[PDB]
Amino acid sequence: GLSDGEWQQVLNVWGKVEADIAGHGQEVLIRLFTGHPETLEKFDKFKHLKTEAEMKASEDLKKHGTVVLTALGGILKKKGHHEAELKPLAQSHATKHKIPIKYLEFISDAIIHVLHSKHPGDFGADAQGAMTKALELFRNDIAAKYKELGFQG
Ligand code: HEM
């Protein structure tokens, strides 16, 4: 788990995201889609986006970014006590959306990238460490739910 100090760092970093949830969410999804085009194919409603310019101009993509980061933020604020929040997300992502855990790794990495991109010099080594642990815990708890379901891809 994370220490109390680590959780405080995570939620301090999260304040940056909360100042511009839509902008952070958009950039995270664009980073995901451009770095890993296979991920776009899981989204019937984003498949039509043929260029990054189109992605940037998509108001629905920004909207989904808000949905994604709002859900993640609610989970992070539980500081690991997130079974009720996380279980349904894991199950919808496995059973309905068919999202391999690899893609959760990709989006976790995208979040770290976007934080540095939007806040260069203001996302310190301790902060990166703590946020990485939180995202690993999130991913790992999802992975346990995936194993329960026998879901791979
Ligand atoms: C931080 C990690 C993620 C969070 C917090 C998150 C959150 C959400 C939420 C709240 C929804 C709407 C409710 C639901 O269907 O459960 C959703 C829908 C969806 N998610 Fe995720 N998600 C994450 C990662 C991913 C990734 C990596 C992919 C694919 C590469 C993905 C694919 C989808 C798809 C296809 C939908 C349905 C979208 C629609 O057509 O409305 N998610 N996600």
Swiss-Prot record:
Organism name: Equus caballus
Protein family according to the UniProt entry: Belongs to the globin family.
Modified residues (Phosphoserine): 3
Gene Ontology CC, one term: sarcoplasm
Subunit structure: Monomeric.
Binding-site residues for nitrite, renumbered to this chain: 64
Catalytic activity: Fe(III)-heme b-[protein] + nitric oxide + H2O = Fe(II)-heme b-[protein] + nitrite + 2 H(+); H2O2 + AH2 = A + 2 H2O
Function: Monomeric heme protein which primary function is to store oxygen and facilitate its diffusion within muscle tissues. Reversibly binds oxygen through a pentacoordinated heme iron and enables its timely and efficient release as needed during periods of heightened demand. Depending on the oxidative conditions of tissues and cells, and in addition to its ability to bind oxygen, it also has a nitrite reductase activity whereby it regulates the production of bioactive nitric oxide.
Gene this protein is translated from: MB
Top-level EC class: oxidoreductase
E.C. numbers: 1.7.-.-, 1.11.1.-
Listed GO MF terms: heme binding; metal ion binding; nitrite reductase activity; oxygen binding; oxygen carrier activity; peroxidase activity
Binding of O2, residues: 64
Binding site for heme b: 93
Compartment annotation: Cytoplasm, Sarcoplasm
Assigned keywords, A-Z: Cytoplasm, Heme, Iron, Metal-binding, Muscle protein, Oxidoreductase, Oxygen transport, Phosphoprotein, Transport
Source taxon at top rank: Eukaryota
GO aspect biological process, one term: removal of superoxide radicals
Coiled coil is among the record's keywords: no
Name of the protein described by the UniProt record: Myoglobin
Domain Globin: 1-147
Cited PANTHER family: MYOGLOBIN (PTHR47132:SF1)
